[PDB]
Amino acid sequence: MENITSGFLGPLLVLQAGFFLLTRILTIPQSLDSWWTSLNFLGGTTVCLGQNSQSPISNHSPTSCPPTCPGYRWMCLRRFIIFLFILLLCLIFLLVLLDYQGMLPVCPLIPGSSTTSTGPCRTCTTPAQGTSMYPSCCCTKPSDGNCTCIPIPSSWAFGKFLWEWASARFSWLSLLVPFVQWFVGLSPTVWLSVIWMMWYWGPSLYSILSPFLPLLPIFFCLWVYI
């Protein structure tokens, strides 16, 4: 009765969802191509210059010219580019889905005497060259050493440990970190004005700063010297 109806609907719902997903996937190539081309075509036109005239003479052309006809390998190349971009977007979305997660570890290392709870050092002494990213700390040392080490804490975690470790490479970036920190410290109605200034207004600043490009190396060398 209803169970048979439910079983059929489940297959029917699966079929409808598959149709919708296929439509979305096909559009993503097609829609991505349309949008990117418009990015070219907003400052451009809609006409296939490579639209041949051997078999057809139709003026339909204009991007996705005529499947096999006219530009064939180039439509395929655009499709491959779209597929690669889709894969990149999927990787980005996978990282975003990971996010803080709460299960993900960064599993970092840093020298300190802090502890999340009651931790007896028992004369924890065994040091080594490069204290950061030391041995596995499964009490891997000349002896066990009564070792307690870092679990995967909760935060951006992996990224935070990443840039903290990478900060040693360029401490100048670490200096600029407070600048961006207070810049992001601004309220929500800050990015709006930032975008408004960013919209247009950019060509003039770019043109003016073009002379400053030679000036930039001079200042960089001056600070490099001192």
Give CA–CA dist 68/49, Å, rounded. 15
Tokens, residue 69: 């006809």
- Binding of its own copies by 117 (CB under 8 A): yes
Cβ neighbourhood burial of 70 (10 Å; 0-12, 13-18, 19+): buried
Q: Least distance from C-beta 58 to its own copies, angstroms?
A: 15
Separation between Cα atoms, residue 127 and residue 145, nearest integer Å: 11
How many CB atoms lie under 10 A from the CB of residue 108?
A: 17
**Any contact of residue 107 with its own copies (CB under 8 A)?**
yes
- Contact string 48-67 vs its own copies (x = CB under 8 A): xxxx-------------x--
69 touching its own copies, by CB under 8 A = no
Q: If DSSP codes are grouped into helix, strand and coil, which group holds residue 150?
A: coil
- For 121, the token pair is 């050092």
Residue 151 or 185 having the CB closest to its own copies: 151
> Is position 44 an interface residue for its own copies (rule: CB under 8 A)?
yes
Is residue 152 within 8 A of residue 107, CB to CB? The reply is: yes
Q: Select 80 or 191, whichever has its Cβ closest to its own copies.
A: 80
User: Judged by CB under 8 A, which stretch of 121-129, 153-161, 168-176, 182-190 contacts its own copies?
Assistant: 153-161
State yes or no: residue 191 binds its own copies (CB under 8 A): no
Q: Give the Å distances, CA to CA, from 130 to 111, 115, 134, 148.
A: 10, 21, 7, 18
Query: Which residues 125-144 are close enough to bind its own copies by CB under 8 A?
Result: 133, 135-139
Torsion 133-138-142-147 (CA) sign: positive
Q: Which of 68, 131, 155, 193 binds its own copies (CB under 8 A)?
A: 68
> What is the residue whose two structure tokens read 């809609």?
46
Residues within the interface to its own copies (CB under 8 A): 10-11, 14-15, 18-19, 22, 36, 39-40, 42-51, 65, 68, 71-78, 80-81, 88, 91-92, 98, 103, 105-109, 116-117, 133, 135-139, 148, 150-153, 158, 161-162, 200, 202-203, 206-207, 213, 216-217, 220-221, 224-225
